């Protein structure tokens, strides 16, 4: 499927490979949880693995189902 990926400088959403049909969205109190925090690494995936205690990636089985918690251009 397609899921927003922050891989690129800007923001966008492409169709994962023939190995991922899900969608994720990392998150962690970045080095600025004070103002920023929670780094969403929008992207795609075939599922949701273990994950870290601080750095966790969401999961979904639909396109644009793992958007940003602040989605917005510029």
């Amino acid at each position: 499927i397609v899921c927003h990926t922050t891989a690129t400088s800007p923001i966008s959403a492409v169709t994962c490979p023939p190995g991922e049909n899900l969608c994720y969205r990392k998150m962690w109190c970045d080095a600025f949880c004070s103002s920023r925090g929670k780094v969403v690494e929008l992207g795609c995936a075939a599922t949701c693995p273990s994950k870290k205690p601080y750095e966790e990636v969401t999961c979904c089985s639909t396109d644009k189902c793992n958007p940003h918690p602040k989605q917005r251009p510029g």
Partner: peptide
């Protein structure tokens, strides 16, 4: 490089 909850800039907003 991510959309950091801060914004959507490739560098913590």
């Amino acid at each position: 490089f991510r959309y950091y909850e801060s914004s959507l800039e490739p560098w913590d907003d």
